[PDB]
């Protein structure tokens with residue numbers, strides 16, 4: 001199975017178009033969006049090519065292939081525009097060998113862990129920092145941000161391919177971090 | 183390569199609950215998927231047979247670590263405080279080889295308000311208390327009916343996913359009420 | 367200013383009809399309902415004359431005079447039946463010389479206090495125990511339950527009259543507790 | 549008796565915010581009532597004049613202890629974590645002698661979806677960015693309009709309750725755009 005992950009888009013049209021381009025070329029079946037989709041975010045500058053209404057038209061074109069959770073920056077007006085369900089604060093995704101716990105990062109995350117099974121995967125964003133590692137009995141995965149990178153990391157996205165979780169550079173496409181989840 | 187058991191619209195019926203649980207224990211299924219309306223009978227419904235919310239809670243908690251549930255229109259916060267598994271999520275997902283199952287109760291997204299889905303995906307819901315298993319257009323609809331207050335003259339039922347087939351099964355007979363194959 | 371308070375009805379039709387009779391005779395302009403309206407409650411025995419669908423018809427007749435907040439036992443189906451807004455976890459009511467902070471008691475209450483002004487009033491239920499006293503710089507008020515009282519108190523309701531907060535017995539009509547707030 | 553100032557649909561406009569705050573400080577009003585859509589411009593709207601969310605936050609917090617607000621369709625939880633006063637409530641109330649003021653943003657309850665109210669009560673809302681002050685049927689409708697993005701050729705505005713009259717006032721001129729007496 002092949003899944004693509006994207007998070008903290010914050011209204012950036014160019015980041016969105018590049019994501020949708022890589023999605024189409026990857027062959028992945030679904031696109032998981034971890035929150036903070038249109039709103040740039042009160043405490044920071046507008047991202048490159050900020051254009052909420054256009055990001056909306058682009059994303060709504062693959063709405064039937066999107067799985068998503070509510071970011072701290074997402075609001076009711078956002079759901080009214082996006083043709084896929086974003087209001088759930090968290091959502092589990094059942095895979096053959098394990099579970100994926102999807103959440104933005106502000107309500108649940110590394111500091112407030114959910115009950116899970118050994119080798120399950122905690123998937124979150126919000127921090128804008130890439131992560132692909134084993135933490136205790138479970139795995140932690142954060143695809144970083146596709147628009148507002150932090151900690152010196154390049155804009156990035158995530159990918160699940162053949163039991164391997166990888167954080168990939170949006171432009172470079174070089175592997176930032178990865179871990180096998182067998 | 184995946185097996186799941188589905189139970190919906192329990193509404194506090196202890197008999198339905200004990201039976202669901204013995205069947206679950208025998209199924210060999212990885213998870214018990216509860217589609218909502220767990221303890222409350224519902225202001226519009228007459229009490230179910232064997233209405234005993236307090237006891238239903240004790241029983242479901244025995245297998246809490248293996249339950250995957252979604253919020254029903256009759257579920258409230260007191261219910262979440264009693265049950266030891268997450269019941270507040272409005273929807274959740276199951277991913278197979280090339281298709282996905284969209285799990286929801288039926289009052290938010292349903293037959294008359296479809297979520298966006300791809301060809302050959304499955305909308306899994308309860309709420310109506312009417313069993314369904316069929317291809318409706320480009321997607322598949324699946325409703326395992328109510329395990330305690332069936333409507334339309336149907337028997338109380340539950341559902342099962344056996345890799346590529348979804349079946350609605352009578353709770354007493356264990357006879358097939360309806361089933362559909364979701365192979366491309 | 368004359369307000370009537372009722373809480374933890376839990377589907378009791380007789381309790382409801384008695385409340386509506388006292389409301390009509392009191393002259394009060396509004397009826398404040400603190401939650402837990404139709405559902406008897408998972409761990410409780412059915413109250414006297416349990417009949418949610420009938421409580422709904424009675425309450426909906428004075429819907430335009432009701433102010434309410436979400437009880438821990440209230441659900442989406444409940445809002446669908448009641449013709450007045452109940453989904454808010456809490457609401458503030460502005461009066462001439464002070465604020466009323468209305469909440470059920472499970473999220474906010476004596477143990478998780480909201481920020482308020484000296485002499486404001488914390489109004490809550492959920493415990494089924496009557497209260498009318500000053501605590502710290504603010505007042506605490508709980509009209510008790512009208513259908514399933516605990517502690518040893520009779521079924522009761524509340525009243526705001528002449529700047530005096532009173533907890534009154536549903537039958538006796540005797541004063542259980544009270545405190546002047548001005 | 550009762551004096552209140554109303555501001556709605558700020559949408560992150562720092563100039564509108566500083567002006568609202570200077571007027572509030574001079575009004576003598578007991579509370580500043582914010583009807584929603586505080587920091588986000590809204591995906592459907594062009595940025596308003598002087599869009600500076602971060603700064604609007606610092607300024608509104610200086611008077612946090614005197615704000616009474618209700619949630620707008622554009623407000624999110626990041627906004628709540630920044631602002632030091634409660635903004636999540638969908639509605640709240642003001643009680644006069646024999647009348648009731650129902651405060652809400654306008655996307656949940658509004659002109660086209662009325663809450664249950666008694667005769668001579670007031671529905672107070674924003675969201676449309678169109679000022680209103682009139683009796684409609686048996687109740688009164690009052691909308692301060694937007695302090696930053698007015699529609700219909702109207703001036704940026706705010707609102708005030710001075711005992712028994714509700715007025716929509718231009719933010720620059722301080723001239724009366726509309727007003728209604730709610731005496732019964």
Ligand SMILES: [Zn+2]
Pocket residue numbers: 008036041126127128
């Ligand atoms: Zn972010």
Ligand SMILES: [Zn+2]
Pocket residue numbers: 036071072073104106125126127
């Ligand atoms: Zn975030």
Ligand SMILES: [Zn+2]
Pocket residue numbers: 191193219224309310311
């Ligand atoms: Zn049901």
Ligand SMILES: [Zn+2]
Pocket residue numbers: 219254255256287289308309310
């Ligand atoms: Zn239902």
Ligand SMILES: [Zn+2]
Pocket residue numbers: 374376402407492493494
């Ligand atoms: Zn109660």
Ligand SMILES: [Zn+2]
Pocket residue numbers: 402437438439470472491492493
């Ligand atoms: Zn309660």
Ligand SMILES: [Zn+2]
Pocket residue numbers: 557559585590675676677
């Ligand atoms: Zn607006």
Ligand SMILES: [Zn+2]
Pocket residue numbers: 585620621622653655674675676
């Ligand atoms: Zn709005």
